[PDB]
């Protein structure tokens, strides 16, 4: 709990978190509530999201959301403003991570599976960021003029994609590449934009694993979701982090297989 | 003099998207002049038909939406019908709109972001999966090589400007795909490379006010001008020849590092 | 609130280079205020002695040329003598001259390029090899961790300006080392990370005309100001705590992308 | 031999090539002579360099050169001007590629071996580039104002350094990182600056290899030095290539060991 001078405040800030019913998004939601923030959990899975909001208590709300939907994205923003009056932080954690070869025995990679991965991972992340940015721009200027922080989730697959990861790598590389042009624009509103590229974490995302985990130099294990949430926490607090993609991966460099 | 090579492009068959104009038209001209056969693919029928006509009997055109499963399959079949095989795919089809995340009239449209992704990223994947399937049937040539796939990203994948969220996302996705696709297709002797062009004299650029074009050229350290599409095509030619180039994104940009505006 | 962590920095020992000023002074202040012990290393005896004095009994200073085998070994031994162990090394020592490849008075001096490399790159390697040797003796702590090494590169490793050949080379070398060193030192539970700072309020910067400092701040998208050394130190603190950060270079730069001039 | 409109001419251009007595530098020397250029071979090894110049014929000269020496670098430039009257292209191929762990049984990595690798690979490359640039700036402006091309050699170790490659990776990453600030400056003189990052080639440089070679996705072999020279040739001819590092590696991504 020691902080630097001119650190940004996290207490009483309102977080919008996608994929919040599980894995990384669930961990960010827990971290934020435990740090004294408010959280609006967004997930397509109502059972998981309602359970998470219930477990977190009155600092949390759940809003069922398909992140690729214009309507649902707008409703998520509206839900946050209804509950807590503002939005300060968006963390995009919703994603899918299929494996499918370009060429298999049973044919070429289906176009629909590529399109779906792009839709959820990349279009969904953009949809939430454009709408969250619009809401954040309405905030009064905080310390140094800051109005909000947007944190996206890429993957080490954006850098070291394995056989079978064309769709996933394309989607996450697209997320990564957006960070800079979005940060450049949203600077005039005091909204920072950052991306975390996780390695292998213990989540439902990759539901072979053991072999990947054994290839992680140090620590020689799957990541704890709370370690991803810790980095989110630091990005929120450290105003100089902007426009960058941070690998959070134990120095993993994935092999082709 | 000679250019050291494995793949000899004479009588090999190129499938080229965006071939009615700009970079794809330049690749098509380069390939025909090097003795290759070319199947030009474009949504612009007028431009594509005129290009194939100008190039002569070594060229064919088929009007194609690269994001369509149907049209992609029809394009492969058209190439096989005309020329019996496919050796090289060059994905040049793309759109490069500018639109702010937060505009005067509201947030960036979801539909426009989706369209840019669809044409630039989904279309490139669609053509690569289908071309790879065809190439995998080829007899291995020099050094075991069955084919080469070359995609077009952009410097916007690295230095995206204000207004380029969609374009940067799409081209960053193309760039990031290169490795996992190359790793897999290596098993078939099919190389996968990406070129990230800087600012080139394309139809869109040529349509801009001269004062604007001149300012864009001035942002490029050397040569301090717009790139000529034939220079992009020359790099495509080198990638085809140089078997050691694989799994990489090459910036072709005069050392440009785009500013925010 | 809490910050999720493995390494607890209370009563752990930091070795910090360039500790008399700027970033290294800020790391030293951060570490002492978090309950750590600090061994400040600098060539500037006056600044180093004053810093250790201001920090109190949890700090020591030893005058050290980081590029010297002898001085590096003496520094390790001094830390072990005072505090019994070394847990964290932070390499902040550096020089950032500007000198053109082709100047008015002739080509860039070879001697000045060599000096910048010597201090920034050779000095960082020298201290990391010796600190790693000491850390490898530590009892494994939380999650098997014996130590953390954090190096300082620069945005110049990515976007080097005119005049920065030597600085960019040195800092690009630091950046590129991170992975092979992390891969090896993983066998000892020692993590290796690099921070690439943008424009910070260091002694050199503070000495520039205000008009100049103000223009530099204006080049940074957000926050549109010089970085505070304590913000660099805060990232150092986070790296120590967050065991999953390893083998990476983190830009801490306000989204700055330096122009050529 | 088909070229694009506005291609830069290679015939009768004068190449200065370091490390020219073996491996990649020897291949560039052969390529350039066979393409109708003049070559001044630079190497510390007089036996190898003299043999190479003899084999290439009257289009070639040898000048013994320690690339890290100010005096020898100046003499190399002077030798080129004496023989051929100008310098058009510099290709820096001289390098050493030792393997040494940070921590071994017999102690920490020697400081002297790190310093030597830096000296030859990085300081030597800078030394030759500063002096070649100064000579190139004296040329009359060619097509589009171009006066020269400088091509440096990094390595895949600049990206994917293995255990034991601290020195090599540092040196080659330093080379890579210089490309942009040097290109930015030398643009005013019409001198382009590019870097090639080779993977594993069949040269004396790496005198384990078989395992590395088996990890190269395609082509599944060591690189031919003539393929590196082919890329050099294309960089010389293609004016739009500037300020960039090109991996030439068969899609190799080196594992830790
Ligand atoms: Zn905090
Ligand atoms: Zn040629």
PDB file of N, CA, C and O and ligand atoms in Angstrom, chain B residues 1-3, chain D residues 1-3 7-8 10 35 233-234 237, ligand 2:
ATOM      1  N   UNK B   1      23.221  -8.780 -65.125  1.00  0.00           N
ATOM      2  CA  UNK B   1      23.531  -9.614 -63.925  1.00  0.00           C
ATOM      3  C   UNK B   1      22.357 -10.519 -63.535  1.00  0.00           C
ATOM      4  O   UNK B   1      21.255 -10.393 -64.080  1.00  0.00           O
ATOM      5  N   UNK B   2      22.612 -11.428 -62.595  1.00  0.00           N
ATOM      6  CA  UNK B   2      21.601 -12.375 -62.114  1.00  0.00           C
ATOM      7  C   UNK B   2      21.108 -11.977 -60.731  1.00  0.00           C
ATOM      8  O   UNK B   2      21.756 -11.194 -60.028  1.00  0.00           O
ATOM      9  N   UNK B   3      19.944 -12.515 -60.359  1.00  0.00           N
ATOM     10  CA  UNK B   3      19.404 -12.391 -59.015  1.00  0.00           C
ATOM     11  C   UNK B   3      19.280 -13.791 -58.482  1.00  0.00           C
ATOM     12  O   UNK B   3      18.526 -14.608 -59.035  1.00  0.00           O
TER      13      UNK B   3
ATOM     14  N   UNK D   1      17.293 -11.013 -63.723  1.00  0.00           N
ATOM     15  CA  UNK D   1      17.788  -9.679 -64.199  1.00  0.00           C
ATOM     16  C   UNK D   1      16.709  -8.677 -64.620  1.00  0.00           C
ATOM     17  O   UNK D   1      17.049  -7.653 -65.213  1.00  0.00           O
ATOM     18  N   UNK D   2      15.428  -8.952 -64.351  1.00  0.00           N
ATOM     19  CA  UNK D   2      14.372  -7.959 -64.596  1.00  0.00           C
ATOM     20  C   UNK D   2      14.364  -7.007 -63.414  1.00  0.00           C
ATOM     21  O   UNK D   2      14.403  -7.467 -62.264  1.00  0.00           O
ATOM     22  N   UNK D   3      14.327  -5.693 -63.693  1.00  0.00           N
ATOM     23  CA  UNK D   3      14.286  -4.652 -62.654  1.00  0.00           C
ATOM     24  C   UNK D   3      13.110  -3.704 -62.827  1.00  0.00           C
ATOM     25  O   UNK D   3      12.617  -3.457 -63.931  1.00  0.00           O
ATOM     26  N   UNK D   7      14.767   1.742 -60.386  1.00  0.00           N
ATOM     27  CA  UNK D   7      15.688   0.936 -59.581  1.00  0.00           C
ATOM     28  C   UNK D   7      17.027   1.641 -59.558  1.00  0.00           C
ATOM     29  O   UNK D   7      17.399   2.327 -60.514  1.00  0.00           O
ATOM     30  N   UNK D   8      17.752   1.457 -58.467  1.00  0.00           N
ATOM     31  CA  UNK D   8      19.092   2.022 -58.361  1.00  0.00           C
ATOM     32  C   UNK D   8      20.090   1.096 -59.023  1.00  0.00           C
ATOM     33  O   UNK D   8      19.947  -0.115 -58.964  1.00  0.00           O
ATOM     34  N   UNK D  10      23.499  -0.912 -59.675  1.00  0.00           N
ATOM     35  CA  UNK D  10      24.551  -1.623 -58.940  1.00  0.00           C
ATOM     36  C   UNK D  10      25.874  -1.703 -59.731  1.00  0.00           C
ATOM     37  O   UNK D  10      26.952  -1.744 -59.118  1.00  0.00           O
ATOM     38  N   UNK D  35      27.982  -9.072 -60.286  1.00  0.00           N
ATOM     39  CA  UNK D  35      27.002  -8.081 -60.761  1.00  0.00           C
ATOM     40  C   UNK D  35      27.613  -6.842 -61.417  1.00  0.00           C
ATOM     41  O   UNK D  35      26.886  -5.905 -61.784  1.00  0.00           O
ATOM     42  N   UNK D 233      21.732  -7.200 -52.331  1.00  0.00           N
ATOM     43  CA  UNK D 233      21.556  -6.736 -53.712  1.00  0.00           C
ATOM     44  C   UNK D 233      20.215  -6.003 -53.846  1.00  0.00           C
ATOM     45  O   UNK D 233      20.147  -4.893 -54.394  1.00  0.00           O
ATOM     46  N   UNK D 234      19.147  -6.612 -53.333  1.00  0.00           N
ATOM     47  CA  UNK D 234      17.843  -5.979 -53.437  1.00  0.00           C
ATOM     48  C   UNK D 234      17.729  -4.655 -52.655  1.00  0.00           C
ATOM     49  O   UNK D 234      17.142  -3.673 -53.152  1.00  0.00           O
ATOM     50  N   UNK D 237      19.177  -1.945 -54.713  1.00  0.00           N
ATOM     51  CA  UNK D 237      18.365  -1.592 -55.871  1.00  0.00           C
ATOM     52  C   UNK D 237      17.011  -0.943 -55.547  1.00  0.00           C
ATOM     53  O   UNK D 237      16.479  -0.187 -56.382  1.00  0.00           O
TER      54      UNK D 237
HETATM   55 ZN1  LIG E   2      19.755  -6.331 -59.760  1.00  0.00          ZN
END
